[PDB]
Symmetry: C2
Subunit: 118 residues, 2 copies
């Protein structure tokens, strides 16, 4: 088995994209009870990466860099290991669309994914 | 009295873009005690928003939606008041580029500038 398969190559972490022939868990993180593991990723996502259904349904409403560098609690330190930036905040979901509940349930399945995983 | 009819027109839901004729604080939040109202900011940014000197240097290393949604501790409750998205995560800057050193200073301007506002 492998645990650090991501170390075999070098990819842009900002533009990271998992593919149907690459381990999604290696690209981003593995499900677990900690934020550093990955609090989002259903058992269907891990099977195909970007070839997974509904993936673009999340990407459509996604926020641009403006709020990310606007109210997301921008704070970093310049350490010898390199800079470490953090982001904290909240946003209201797209309540005006007829697909609002579908988006809420879709997203919730990935969050509470580890709750139904073996 | 409400009268606000502008909201009937289609404005960017999560693609907030503040222009020279607009107020960055109205698009994000008003710099104050709450974390979510964007306590950080530069008084020269509020002048023009997207027309601010160095504006594209921030977005040049912004995480794509694929990175923004996964290892970011995404959690939201389905409340009557709406669904409230929250997040907590870290990012590594584009420390493999020569402009990184300039970006560090530029980004930090807004992080300390708020404390020097009148």
């Amino acid at each position: 088995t492998k645990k650090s398969a991501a170390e075999a190559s070098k990819k842009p972490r900002q533009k990271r994209t998992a593919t149907k022939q690459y381990n999604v868990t290696q690209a981003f993180g593995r499900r677990g009870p900690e934020q550093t593991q990955g609090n989002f990723g259903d058992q269907d996502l891990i099977r195909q990466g970007t070839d997974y259904k509904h993936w673009p349904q999340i990407a459509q409403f996604a926020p641009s860099a403006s709020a990310f560098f606007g109210m997301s609690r921008i704070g970093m330190e310049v350490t010898p290991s390199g800079t470490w930036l953090t982001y904290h905040g909240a946003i209201k979901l797209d309540d005006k669309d007829p697909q609002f509940k579908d988006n809420v349930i879709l997203l919730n399945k990935h969050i509470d994914a580890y709750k139904t995983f073996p």
